[PDB]
Design a binder for these strands. Structure first.
Ligand SMILES: *O[C@H]1[C@@H](O)[C@H](n2cnc3c(=O)[nH]c(N)nc32)O[C@@H]1COP(=O)(O)OP(=O)(O)OP(=O)(O)O
Ligand SMILES: C[S@@+](CC[C@H](N)C(=O)[O-])C[C@H]1O[C@@H](n2cnc3c(N)ncnc32)[C@H](O)[C@@H]1O
Lengths: 255, 284, 255, 255, 255
RNA sequence: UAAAUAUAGUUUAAAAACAUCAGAUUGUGAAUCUGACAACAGAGGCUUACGACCCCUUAUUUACC
């Protein structure tokens, strides 16, 4: 069970992160929202009750994450689960011959820092906090859950920047799991497909309807609550480690 | 009503009046202010039934022939589900088009200059124009601008598409094209434009007026393109084609097909094939 | 939740299948053990109580599976979950030049018949039973869970026959998921590796202890109860479809 | 180089297998066609010249393959390359609710026998003859190339039987390479997409045009000669072993 | 054939890049070595003859690559092949509880810029150069080959940063291939295992010899010349697109 | 200005053929099924009607010594 566990959810002020916080808090766990100051996470933290707090920090900054982790220690005393959900995306082709447009390097860099570098920054810093924890009956010190995407396996046109960052998370899932295996920290990656999140809401409403209808079953956008349910299952299952789970309804994205 | 018997007697006169007519068609005949308008409208209904009945007689013949033949009368890699597969494949391309495809704008501000006969035809060509876009290798990002929700054009489009209207992969809105794209990247295509278009630029937005002027109204689109400071262009029909017969205002389906070929690196030889052959005596 | 659901657990007399039956029955669900007549599954069914029944049948044969499905229909009235756990393993090298020994085609056919052909036989027959179920609020008629192996991706020496059968399950999980998507049936596959089943425990104690230490974390053989927990999570999660989940503790087997 | 090597091309009377024979024979190698008697293998062998011979055999039967391989030894004296191109394609939905039709078990069984079981029958028998070869300067005794398909990764609707058989080839490609690594035999697998084989070309040109456009680039059906080129590259590359190569033009099959 | 083709090989002053240049130049092609000024690539270009030139540039910077590509345009007039072999590796655990050492963010960023950002920087910039090329009889404008690593699938301990960068390349291989498919540029990725590069041979024989013995077959470090052979095969084969080719001798890494 | 012409998906000839839209989980004639749309430049007239016949507008192509 997740009763009594302390969870540090990155980007927990909205989208998948907020849904994960709601379920874990409702199940007796304690959540620490870790999002940007302007994300409005303070209001969400108050709504979720006294078991949830808001940590204003930027994932790409080592100092900011350390302050957020220090805040989690003061309020709850320990960190047991880390969920990486913060991410950004850009819809730009690598090169457009007709328009003579080339993908901006800054756009590629920006996605990398938040999606990939930001995920590693939390993983390495949060793992240090989890090291202080004493092993339980199973010898586990903590659980780290990363949020990849189906784009890491098959990405659409113009998703090179987003795919590259999510591809890195998938590639580095097992090496980090092996790295932290001696200290008993489990690393897992969830590759959600089309979910009702602000990342996919930016697309035209008619695009969203078609993409939702293309899911074999269920033929709808992934509910963020479903993502939270899978997160809880990974936490409860001790034998899930170093694996990428695709939560997308068996949809393969054509170009 | 006095109009109902007005038709029945015309039936006795044999005024090419159909046999069965719905009350909905009767009020359309009511709007006809002139007898010739009533005469013209009734003939359209008459030929409408003639084609349907001839269609039906030739249709039941198909069923009768097929069943008779059946009475007298392995390894596969794919199931015969192709028609579904193509629709999905076009949908995926269409979704990509609205994120990166070149915007093509259909202007729907001409509803005030169209009768019911021409308004119906405009939708027919719009259905075909969008149909060819879907099947193209690189579909346009079709925009339906100035499309009033309660307007006749919007209502007619819904009936012809039924539930498919909300699932079409195109942007339909009430805002003018100037409000969606920079005014310096908009080219209002029109046969009356003093400027002749030589090269299809991929960084520009082309506006096609969804207007079917059976009753010729020259300069209607040019005035719209001149009220707002928008550039205008015309196809080089005279430059390449030996025009001999017909009007130079091509249909919407032909227009989009011409642009589609040009956008796919096709030259004027291939692009201008879609112009009706009856209009021109060869190419040069 | 799984309360009230009827599950047809293939190979439920012992091993992973039995562990799944224990959890589902204890959670309020109804189980139908489907194993060989000599497997002793009736004794296990009696232990689990009234909610559990034993249906002796052979997966490789159409007739017996149909009778087993009929027994489930008569006893409970419907089938909601199908779990495929029956399978056999053969440890024979493809060809040993030193001994001049060639892998026998009979061993390869037998492994395929039970692991691969048997799995498809249950899927196609059990799918018809779920086709009669009225769609629920989510439009789902049932769920099918398969049991692949880590050998399908990282196979060892002498596991060619086992890998081929489990590779087919991984290959065919998505085509079947697409096949049954219009009906509203979710097809999922689990690829457990090095679990504490009788088969693995039968091997030399010196060897099994070594393998138990090769798992990065937890450094122990997979608990069959853990496999049952993942089965429940797949059933509860509506968005898990057409995916292979590796439940092995981040272990990549070596030559 | 491939000059002087003796190649046993299974299913070499037509399709991909035939195209492989032309290139290898045209490059100085010797080919041994192994196809069914009903096929026009005898005519093709004569056309290819004195360096090509036809061995009528059924892959699913051990005796047929043994005689065919013995024929190669008599004519040429050794076997250096093996190409598994023989297979059958069956399309059938797992279960159709509206039609009430269930997938026939015989259809599934026969596909497995030829595509999967037949391929393994050749692999385990050729390795015996490759085991008699003296290792070359690189310590290699022979090369075995299998013909998987993109269906092994994302199969379409009704391809459950085809995907399962091809998935087994992809699953067991690495275990066999590990089995035969001490002997010195390299095992490789190719997964072509849509190729202009006689089976594919028999479809209406309306269907063929749609399939051609499905390939991102090149937007055409795969040339059988292109498949032969990769076969030569695998043979000429000593470091290609235990890997699956998709010769499909970056296409991902949709449902 | 590769006769007359112009290839831009990043990191071509030594290692795999130099081997590819040697083979391509010897086969009639013209190569443009794109490496750092201190790499000593000017001498290598002189050795390869008048058909090879050295363009000093840093892949991480847009300005340097553009100047290097301008040099290639002036010297040869066109670019036909782009081989991305430039890259560096770092060895550092994510977190060391025993030593209380945390993976500093500097190295993770450093590897990402060179291996991941540098690869994308060349891909987008060179794609413009290939865009100007007229399509050939096959409609192809150019070929882009990326150098991933086997660590992108199963990385070792301390390779989290290296795996993430190489994992990204695998992720964006298909999205870029779909992006450039209309243009007519083939994007392919090679995932070499352990090769006899100067960096690997610098390690002590105690570890170098052990790694060589871990390859099933051939049981030796990959020859860089063999990597060039695979590169030529990808260039010549028109149907190879959007795939990751593992050139490692069927070896899977242990933790 | 005058004389011949004008098919709003495209041709044919004086009503058809090929296309278009919606629905289809199609067992490989779907090579089909059930629907949608069928206006020979436009408008106004004449006549029991006629696509005839007669004015008017626009448009196209020629001629304007
Ligand atoms: O009526 C014509 C015509 O008398 C004359 N005109 C113009 N072009 C030509 C030509 O090529 N060949 C001949 N024989 N005559 C030509 O000028 C008139 C032009 O008519 P417009 O209506 O265009 O001129 P305006 O704007 O002044 O109105 P209107 O009062 O004459 O109708
Ligand atoms: C058949 S035209 C009818 C409207 C006509 N422009 C008018 O004012 O009377 C319909 C649309 O097709 C486009 N179009 C028709 N012919 C064209 C041509 N020759 N050159 C450029 N555009 C043309 C125009 O943009 C116009 O909006």
């Amino acid at each position: 069970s997740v009763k009594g566990l302390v969870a540090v959810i990155t980007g927990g002020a909205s989208g998948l992160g907020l849904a994960t916080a709601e379920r874990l808090v409702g199940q007796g766990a304690s959540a620490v929202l870790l999002d940007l100051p302007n994300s409005g996470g303070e209001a969400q933290a108050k709504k979720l009750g006294n078991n949830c707090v808001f940590a204003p920090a930027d994932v790409t900054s080592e100092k900011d994450v350390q302050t957020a982790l220090a805040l989690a220690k003061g309020k709850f005393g320990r960190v047991d689960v880390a969920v990486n959900c913060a991410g950004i995306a850009v819809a730009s082709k690598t090169y457009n011959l007709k328009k003579g447009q080339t993908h901006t390097l800054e756009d590629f860099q920006r996605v990398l820092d938040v999606n990939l570098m930001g995920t590693f920054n939390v993983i390495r810093l949060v793992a240090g906090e989890m090291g202080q924890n004493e092993p339980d009956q199973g010898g586990q010190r903590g659980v780290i859950i990363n949020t990849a995407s189906v784009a890491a396996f098959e990405g659409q046109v113009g998703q090179a920047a987003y795919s590259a960052s999510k591809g890195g998370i998938v590639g580095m899932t097992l090496p980090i799991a092996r790295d932290l295996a001696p200290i008993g920290i489990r690393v897992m990656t969830i590759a959600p497909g089309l979910f009702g999140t602000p990342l996919l809401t930016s697309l035209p409403e008619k695009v969203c309807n078609f993409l939702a209808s293309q899911v074999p079953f269920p033929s709808r956008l992934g509910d963020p609550a479903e993502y939270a349910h899978l997160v809880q299952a990974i936490i409860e299952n001790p034998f899930l480690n170093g694996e990428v789970i695709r939560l997308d309804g068996a949809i393969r994205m054509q170009p | 009503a006095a109009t109902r018997e007005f038709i029945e007697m015309w039936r006795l006169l044999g005024r090419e009046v159909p046999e069965h007519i719905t009350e909905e068609e009767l009020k359309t005949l009511m709007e006809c202010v002139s007898n010739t308008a009533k005469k013209k409208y009734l003939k359209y209904l008459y030929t409408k039934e003639k084609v349907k009945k001839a269609r039906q007689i030739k249709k039941e013949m198909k069923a009768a022939a097929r069943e008779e033949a059946k009475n007298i009368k392995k390894n596969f890699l794919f199931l015969r589900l192709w028609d579904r597969n193509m629709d999905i494949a076009m949908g995926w391309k269409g979704a990509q088009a609205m994120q990166f495809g070149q915007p093509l704008v259909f202007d729907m501000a001409y509803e005030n200059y169209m009768k019911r006969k021409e308004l119906q035809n405009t939708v027919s060509q719009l259905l075909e124009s969008e149909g060819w876009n879907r099947r193209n290798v690189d579909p346009f990002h079709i925009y339906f601008c100035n499309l009033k929700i309660d307007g006749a054009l919007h209502r007619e489009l819904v009936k012809r598409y039924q539930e498919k209207w909300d699932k079409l992969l195109l942007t339909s809105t009430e805002k003018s094209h100037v409000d969606l794209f920079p005014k310096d990247s908009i080219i209002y295509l029109t046969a009356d434009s003093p400027n002749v278009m030589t090269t299809f630029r991929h960084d520009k937005v082309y506006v096609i007026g969804s207007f079917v002027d059976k009753s010729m109204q020259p300069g209607t689109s040019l005035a719209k393109a001149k009220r707002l400071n928008l550039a205008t262009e015309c196809l080089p029909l005279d430059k390449y084609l030996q025009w001999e017969i017909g009007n130079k205002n091509l249909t919407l389906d032909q227009m989009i097909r011409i642009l589609l070929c040009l956008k796919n690196n096709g030259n004027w030889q291939e692009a201008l094939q879609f112009v009706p052959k009856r209009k021109h005596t060869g190419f040069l």
